[PDB]
Design a binder for this molecule. Structure first.
Ligand SMILES: CO[C@H]1O[C@H](CO)[C@@H](O)[C@H](O)[C@H]1O
Ligand SMILES: [Ca+2]
Ligand SMILES: [Ca+2]
Ligand SMILES: [Ca+2]
Ligand SMILES: [Ca+2]
Ligand SMILES: [Ca+2]
Ligand SMILES: [Ca+2]
Ligand SMILES: [Ca+2]
Ligand SMILES: [Ca+2]
Length: 182
């Protein structure tokens, strides 16, 4: 049975190879078991320095979510996270605005809705709008990585045409698509 919690299922992967793009990180995820798992209940991570994959930097980056880590990974040069689960959204129009170092991809109901397919120092992109056709728990997944140096990841979402944005957190996240009461 899968744990029901108000968050996404988190997996962390580290590597001593260079992560240059989304393909490289997804290949890392498919290559092995997660180096750690966690509950992603407050998806606003970092900012920090001196490589996410070194020392306790992952714990610092994950902050409020670090207390759910399954283990303390050893050192790597490069690393990233894969989050998957569900997000409660009412039918309507939305767009992401993401602050990140390095890149990332977010999908909703299997369709990319926010993509940065390269390394970058901290940058904020306002992404194109997408529609939700039916109110309820939408499938969501995210990948983010750090090739080294600084690291930050804060996807925010707007329901009102970019006037206000919110962090994805325990108010609307579900690990399985059932209603969490945690
Ligand atoms: C040179 O380092 C800078 O740029 C790279 C991307 O090239 C980022 O990954 C890193 O965090 C940032 O500090
Ligand atoms: Ca895997
Ligand atoms: Ca460590
Ligand atoms: Ca924090
Ligand atoms: Ca905590
Ligand atoms: Ca730069
Ligand atoms: Ca690297
Ligand atoms: Ca970096
Ligand atoms: Ca505003």
């Amino acid at each position: 049975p899968d744990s029901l919690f108000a968050g996404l299922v988190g997996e962390y992967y580290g590597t001593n190879s260079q992560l240059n793009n989304i393909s490289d990180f997804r290949a890392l995820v498919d290559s092995k078991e997660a180096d750690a798992t966690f509950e992603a209940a407050n998806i606003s991570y970092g900012r920090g320095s001196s490589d996410v994959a070194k020392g306790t930097h992952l714990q610092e980056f994950l902050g409020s979510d670090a207390s759910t880590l399954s283990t303390d990974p050893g050192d790597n040069t490069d690393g990233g996270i894969y989050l998957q689960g569900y997000v409660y959204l009412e039918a309507g129009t939305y767009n992401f605005k993401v602050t990140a170092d390095d890149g990332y991809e977010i999908t909703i109901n299997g369709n990319p809705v926010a993509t940065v397919d390269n390394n970058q120092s901290v940058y904020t992109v306002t992404h194109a709008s997408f529609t939700i056709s039916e109110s309820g728990y939408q499938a969501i997944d995210m990948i983010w990585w750090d090739q080294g140096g600084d690291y930050v990841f804060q996807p925010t979402l707007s329901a009102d045409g970019g006037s206000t944005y919110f962090v994805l957190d325990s108010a609307i996240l579900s690990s399985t698509g059932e209603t969490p009461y945690t």
